[PDB]
Design a protein around this ligand. Sequence first.
Ligand SMILES: OC[C@H]1O[C@@H](O[C@H]2[C@H](O)[C@H](O)[C@H](O[C@H]3[C@H](O)[C@H](O)[C@H](O[C@H]4[C@H](O)[C@H](O)[C@H](O[C@H]5[C@H](O)[C@H](O)[C@H](O[C@H]6[C@H](O)[C@H](O)[C@H](O)O[C@@H]6CO)O[C@@H]5CO)O[C@@H]4CO)O[C@@H]3CO)O[C@@H]2CO)[C@@H](O)[C@@H](O)[C@@H]1O
Ligand SMILES: [Mg+2]
Ligand SMILES: [Mg+2]
Length: 539
Amino acid sequence: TFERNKTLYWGGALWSPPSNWNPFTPWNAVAGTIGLVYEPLFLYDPLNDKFEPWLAEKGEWVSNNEYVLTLRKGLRWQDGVPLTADDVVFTFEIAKKYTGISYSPVWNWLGRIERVDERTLKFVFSDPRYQEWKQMLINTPIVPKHIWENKTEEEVLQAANENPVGSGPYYVESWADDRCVFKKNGNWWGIRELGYDPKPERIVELRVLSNNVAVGMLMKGELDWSNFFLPGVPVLKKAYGIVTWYENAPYMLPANTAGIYINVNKYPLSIPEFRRAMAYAINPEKIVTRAYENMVTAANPAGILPLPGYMKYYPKEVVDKYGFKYDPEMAKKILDELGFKDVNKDGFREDPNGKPFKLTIECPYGWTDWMVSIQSIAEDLVKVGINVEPKYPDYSKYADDLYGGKFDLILNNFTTGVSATIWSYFNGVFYPDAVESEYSYSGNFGKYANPEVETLLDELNRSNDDAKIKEVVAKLSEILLKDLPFIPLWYNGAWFQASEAVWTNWPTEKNPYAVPIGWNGWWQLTGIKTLFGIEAKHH
Ligand SMILES: OC[C@H]1O[C@@H](O[C@H]2[C@H](O)[C@H](O)[C@H](O[C@H]3[C@H](O)[C@H](O)[C@H](O[C@H]4[C@H](O)[C@H](O)[C@H](O[C@H]5[C@H](O)[C@H](O)[C@H](O[C@H]6[C@H](O)[C@H](O)[C@H](O)O[C@@H]6CO)O[C@@H]5CO)O[C@@H]4CO)O[C@@H]3CO)O[C@@H]2CO)[C@@H](O)[C@@H](O)[C@@H]1O
Ligand SMILES: [Mg+2]
Ligand SMILES: [Mg+2]
């Protein structure tokens, strides 16, 4: 049995049976595969807007189109093989050869990677996409050449990669239908080279079928670290000693923009004015109150996260002029203009030819707050005569629906999260390559096309000037508000609560040494630093 005071029980990110640890497919890999096992060149600290060199010792643009990366000495894979610049070169170059790899488009703007010396690389760009490069530095996991280099593309993309060999502080000890057990690598290079020493001997990542199940686990100290949404936080804190980021309401940091992606290839969702009608029909405040007990705030119409590094580009003129707000009369007005009228007194508008139509809205089953939220959204839409039914596929079906574009309306936040650049938000909304691609893992899940938007995304991407960025953000926001491929509704929380029954010194507002979120994508946003600060109450 695992000794209690050396074991960290964590959940909130495991919504399918653990079966994949492939760093090339983080959408399917067990959360923590990126972070615990495979590592990035840099972390990004969103609390302070700062990069922390991780595998890298340093990185800088030495010219308009050359980025010099210096790797730390003494880096090592979990199998003892040195991790070197060879592996970084390979991580990028494998995607030149194998276009099926998700980040293969990097080679449309990266020209070559020069080896300067033993630990230094010079990335030379044909098209220096500064904003997108920031994201690559924290999101691209470095993989071992000596393990992956002889695999075919099918092998690379399909491999379950059981017993993954990464360079990180934990490896996989065991797994089963309800858990993945990570075990500490006592020889992790980071101990010597960074002076970080992860405290848990084991991290047990738990799966539950619904947030409902996690409540009792946290209450009883069976769960230490929760990245679940849990209701009734005031009671958890008062009666069970639960800690959160903020001591008082709203308790939770914002994490991302939750909104509705719309299948623009399904009638009548193809009609931009119909999408604007839906936006006017929805009451985000009812969601904020009913689902979240005011732990979140409603989104501004552009969906720009209420953080300083984003809000410095807020397009107030554009939003004042082109924004939407909750107004059922305006929704009814537009629907009537479009000819969608109830001809049979069933409370549902038929189409202009008198035919019925109805739509689905979906979220993952067991994501209890999103279930309540899409019930609320559906109710709002039905109230102006749009027949919308909530559906709760399991996470895996939800994800296949999302990535494959097989939905009507879908509540999502996967690409609209906290990042090093506002470019990632607009890319997460508009991702042009989604349109012709079978699956999209990068955004624009409803496959909205707009050639003008593509040029603007690139303009923003290529800019390093605040004035220029502000100008382009305004143009992008105007098109977002006119065509609404994505309807922003609220900022979903960075859900974090912890039990102090075993582990203490959690990071909080007053002790902000890490952002304690272990969802995929968040280890590199300093989730990993959680592990070096927590303290086991008892030896
Ligand atoms: O409140 C509701 C419930 O919340 C639960 O917790 C949720 C949480 O709220 C949130 O939904 C979270 O979402 C995860 C998600 O599960 C998934 O892991 C997701 O993974 C993303 C990832 O963040 C990136 O967006 C990634 O984008 C990359 C692309 O895949 C691709 O590699 C791309 O490659 C480009 C390349 O880098 C280069 O730029 C080149 O030029 O072009 C390439 C192509 O574009 O690079 C992208 C960026 O790196 O995609 C994946 C998949 O979309 O990450 C989010 C965020 O964490 O999930 C959790 C649950 O796990 C619970 O709290 C529950 O209790 C609540 O009820
Ligand atoms: Mg307290
Ligand atoms: Mg009718």
